[model samples]
Target: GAMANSDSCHKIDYGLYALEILAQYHNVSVNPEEIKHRFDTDGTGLGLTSWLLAAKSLELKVKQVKKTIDRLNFISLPALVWREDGRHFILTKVSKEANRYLIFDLEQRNPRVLEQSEFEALYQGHIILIASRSSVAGKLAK
Candidate 1:
């Protein structure tokens, strides 16, 4: 339901969660439980986007990002976060400043932030795919 928390959360953690989640829904060949066990003990390196387009190849198909979480840090519902969105942000400086760990949300096409609790929920084992909200909101009725 939510991500586990520890002081050492890093790019490794982020990457693992993504792979774990992606494989879980899209690949089946991988085990998320084992991945979690390794994350609890391993120290490692990190990594996504154009990811929406690429995840298509991988079979991931969704996007999720919260706006005004009323709390802390973070971005695009992957729709690759930092690596592809830019090391920093896509939203205005005003919006980005509200949270410490802002992420470039492909959904917002802006720097998106989450409350502290939300950020935890995210990397703490949450796996997400994305369908643009605008699309889900229904095509322009015009």
Candidate 2:
């Protein structure tokens, strides 16, 4: 089945969708609907605890950290960046221009560029670092 776009519901959890995008980037399998069904049952969106728990259920390791947009490192990318409006988006890549970052947001079909200043203004300095459980375990196994 096709996954619904993150913007399908007005009360959708952008956090969960950000996690889904992160999981997909890491080549991990995650069902968006399952995540919504399990964690966002009330349709009001996911709370902080439920969001983290859902990320865990999808075999993602999450770390909560604080960093201003300019200080974000590439190694910590594919991060869930929180906006002041409570919406979340995936910070996917570093552009050739340091001031521009590529991000995956709720409604866009493609990654968009976010200016550092624009991000800084909207950003709440909350970064949720995401990595796949198996990727870490596999490296540890080697």
Candidate 3:
């Protein structure tokens, strides 16, 4: 957060780490400051919304990876949003349904649609790792 307030950046590796993660997820090379100029309101750095907005343009596919998750209830934004599942960039139709997460490839193929409860069954150990790591971040990502 100090990076957001100072004349120069601080804790920059972690910021690049996120950029690197997104680059891997989209399979593209990005210049972070180029994206941040538009995303940051105060020329500080990206807030939560800016992070997602920056990703919107990084994908080369104006039409790449067109796929779907079959949530017949069909969730909408104000609730719905995108997230990365490894190399997959996914649209999460947030809901209290049997299925909510849609995982697909960068080109938007090989979609895996599943419920939140069902997905959690596969990742408690990973969650343990996350919990352990987050405890030490000292508000880095909080």
Candidate 4:
């Protein structure tokens, strides 16, 4: 059967079949139910080039700011990508509830102690909100 909204209305693709076989070898069944449950449908289509570009952009800005100490202070988080339609979406997962995430553009901002009101806004409707610095190299290194 064809995916309702996709351009193609035919059988499965070869790449999908290959992945299914690989999964089976690893003792994973590729049935629709299993696949739907395990697959991150919301987070599936980002490309490597786009991801690398974002990373590199961040690195350059970090170097330019001479915040090597700060960069070293924070830990490196894993990168993730999602698919919306046919476009690739690369984003870092920060707070799922706050829908908060970091990117190269916001990396160079000065660090500050968030105010109670600000904190409350971010933690609204949530149980706990923990903020910590990563062990990267710039801000948290010292």
Candidate 5:
């Protein structure tokens, strides 16, 4: 139908969705509309830079790292990882003993547990680590 075109035109950007999930992990809430209004002023649809800016504005410390899976283990949990399919997922837990990880994908209803090898096969080395700033804690404390 002709409505399809309109829907596609107004479709939410993938990064925005990813950021929303990431924000939630840090216990910080965000309305994507507000993020678009505040940081995506240029209307670029929340690219990498805009995504990082949005995270920072929400008091979430972000580290975008392109590292090997082994090195990635040293990073903080609840990070955002990019897959070769051009989709993003939130990495909620890393179980070194089991050599697997618990990840939340927008496309999936429940969190997925994947073996390290399986994850490496899908992941393409790009990750974004996010943590709540002390200010968020202070705000909650008050």
Candidate 6:
């Protein structure tokens, strides 16, 4: 006989539980426009710190920051590498000079800021990955 109460059936409910945990921690009460903007910019609700904080409050054992870094590292690098290869890839076109303007705007407007070295490292890492398909492969090999 099949198990009457199988764990497989509970997976969706568990995911919902995780989401509820996330919502409670971050104090997220925003309009659809804000949520849309967030998704447009960050790709996922968990990408936003506010949402991660909410999730953290739930005490679900999964560290939102670590998960976010993992997800970003996985998703961004491949696309960035493809773009660097001179292939048409989807992303905003911003010049290096314009990046300085962006940094200034972020520093002036947002209290949370990255150091210049950190910023350059992130940017360069992505570009290098895009320029060399071997970059991610090399790192994985290491």
Highest lDDT model number: 5
Residue-wise lDDT of candidate 3 within 29-135, one digit each (tens)? 56666766666545555544555455455652111221233331242211122233322233323345554554333343344565667544322221100011112
Per-residue lDDT for 1-142 in model 4, tens only? 3566765433332222222322332333344333322332223421233322222332211111111212211322211112222221111224434434432111222222333344333322211111112223222222
User: Residue 74, candidate 1: how far off, in angstroms?
Assistant: 17
Worst 10 residues of 4 by lDDT: 60-69
Which runs of model 6 end up more than 4 angstroms from their true locations?
A: 1-18, 21-47, 64-142
lDDT of 6: 0.27
**Ranking of all predicted structures according to TM-score, beginning with the best and ending with the worst:** 2, 5, 3, 1, 4, 6
Give, for candidate 5, the lowest lDDT window spanning 10 residues. 133-142
lDDT by residue (tens digit), candidate 5, 1-142: 3675654344565567777877775677888888988866666567666788888888778768797777556666666785545467777666778889878776653588888998877778888777786432212212
TM-score of candidate 4 to 2 decimals: 0.19
lDDT of 6 at 49: 41
Off by over 4 Å in 2: 1-12, 95-97, 136-142
Candidate 3 versus truth, CA RMSD in Å, comes to 14.6
Judging by lDDT, tell me the better candidate of 2 and 3. Answer: 2
lDDT values for all models: 0.36, 0.69, 0.37, 0.26, 0.70, 0.27
Off by over 4 Å in 1: 1-13, 25-48, 64-66, 70-142
Q: Could you tell me every candidate's TM-score relative to the true structure?
A: 0.26, 0.75, 0.33, 0.19, 0.72, 0.17
On the 0 to 100 scale, the lDDT of residue 100 in model 1 is 40
lDDT of candidate 5 vs native? 0.70
| Candidates in descending lDDT order | 5, 2, 3, 1, 6, 4
Instruction: Please give the TM-score that candidate 6 achieves against the real structure.
Output: 0.17
Q: How close to the true structure is residue 83 of candidate 5, measured as C-alpha lDDT?
A: 51
lDDT by residue (tens digit), candidate 6, 55-108: 233332222222222233343222221112222121112233333211212112
Q: What value of lDDT does candidate 1 attain over all alpha carbons?
A: 0.36
